[PDB]
Design an enzyme around this catalytic site. Structure first.
Site, short mmCIF file in Angstrom:
data_model
loop_
_atom_site.label_atom_id
_atom_site.label_comp_id
_atom_site.label_asym_id
_atom_site.label_seq_id
_atom_site.Cartn_x
_atom_site.Cartn_y
_atom_site.Cartn_z
N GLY A 30 0.86 -1.10 -0.02
CA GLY A 30 0.05 0.10 0.04
C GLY A 30 0.95 1.43 -0.06
O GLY A 30 1.92 1.12 -0.83
N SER A 73 6.18 -5.16 -1.24
CA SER A 73 5.83 -3.75 -1.61
C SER A 73 6.40 -2.60 -0.45
O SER A 73 7.49 -2.77 -0.10
CB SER A 73 4.52 -3.39 -2.17
OG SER A 73 4.09 -2.26 -2.66
N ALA A 74 5.42 -1.94 -0.07
CA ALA A 74 5.72 -0.80 1.13
C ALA A 74 6.19 -1.69 2.05
O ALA A 74 7.15 -1.21 2.74
CB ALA A 74 4.45 -0.54 1.39
N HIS A 91 8.79 -2.95 -7.03
CA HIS A 91 8.15 -2.54 -8.40
C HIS A 91 9.08 -1.95 -9.45
O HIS A 91 8.55 -0.94 -10.14
CB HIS A 91 6.75 -1.53 -8.25
CG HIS A 91 6.03 -2.08 -7.26
ND1 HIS A 91 5.26 -3.00 -7.16
CD2 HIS A 91 5.99 -1.65 -5.93
CE1 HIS A 91 4.58 -3.39 -5.95
NE2 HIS A 91 4.82 -2.44 -5.02
N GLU A 96 8.93 -6.19 -10.21
CA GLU A 96 7.79 -7.27 -9.83
C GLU A 96 8.14 -8.84 -10.13
O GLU A 96 9.13 -9.07 -11.15
CB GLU A 96 6.53 -6.80 -10.58
CG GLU A 96 6.22 -5.51 -9.83
CD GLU A 96 4.77 -4.97 -10.28
OE1 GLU A 96 4.23 -5.67 -11.30
OE2 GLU A 96 4.20 -4.14 -9.30
#
Length: 220
Positions: A88, A120-121, A157, A183
């Site tokens: 997120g 991700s985050a 990413h 990714e």
């Protein structure tokens, strides 16, 4: 230390965290109790974010509790065997973790043996700072320092421009190593070894150095 740092949660055409499951199963070593840190999430409720995770990880023997749904989140972290940090917005993840007094407790608990899983985050959060997020600064986290568990900076990413933005960071912070983690890829830190995995090309950026492509199995 035991970390699994994923660029992202879901491969194209696959289920959310599907590519992560064998990696987690290999690394759990019998751990069961997990806290999920949902605070990066914005457009989905945290409550709902915690269920997806519990669904796919319960068969692996992982009992996931959302840290927003326990009476004593500090104690939950202190007792957890696994800390799971979802994707997120990285700034909101860090703001909430900091304001709630959970950032040092999470780091301490991983230092004391818990498995950290982040995508991700949540991969950004493991690094010294969040200076290599791609995210928009939608909230001020009152400091860019993060868990400082993994010493290199991850740009998840990753796709290239992005290298030029990283090169500006390397002017202001010339000592940094920045990993452009595409990714599909991950870094698994286990039994004294940080190992790159996944099928796409990973890049590393250091000041004054041409970008270097790293192969699966590369050890940091």
């Amino acid at each position: 230390m035991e970390l699994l740092l994923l660029s992202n949660s879901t491969l194209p055409g696959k289920a959310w965290l599907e590519h992560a499951l064998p990696l987690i199963a290999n690394q759990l070593n019998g751990r069961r109790s997990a806290v999920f840190i949902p605070f990066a999430g914005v457009t989905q409720t945290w409550d709902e974010y915690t269920d997806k995770t519990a669904e796919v990880l319960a068969p692996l023997g992982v009992n996931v509790t959302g840290i927003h749904r326990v009476a004593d989140p500090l104690a939950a972290i202190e007792k957890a065997e696994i800390i799971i940090v979802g994707g997120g917005n990285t700034f909101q993840l860090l703001k909430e973790s900091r304001e709630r007094g959970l950032l040092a407790p999470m780091a301490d608990r991983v230092k004391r043996g818990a498995l950290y899983i982040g995508w991700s985050a949540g991969a950004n959060l493991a690094c010294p700072t969040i200076r290599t997020t791609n995210d928009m600064p939608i909230v001020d986290p009152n400091g860019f320092d993060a868990l400082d568990l993994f010493p290199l900076q991850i740009n998840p990413h990753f796709t290239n421009t992005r290298e030029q933005r990283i090169r500006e960071l390397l002017v202001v912070a010339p000592e940094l190593t920045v990993i452009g983690l595409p990714e599909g890829n991950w870094i698994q830190v286990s039994n004294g070894q940080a190992v790159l995995g996944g099928p796409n090309t990973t890049w590393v950026f250091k000041a004054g150095e041409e970008a270097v492509a790293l192969e699966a199995g590369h050890r940091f």
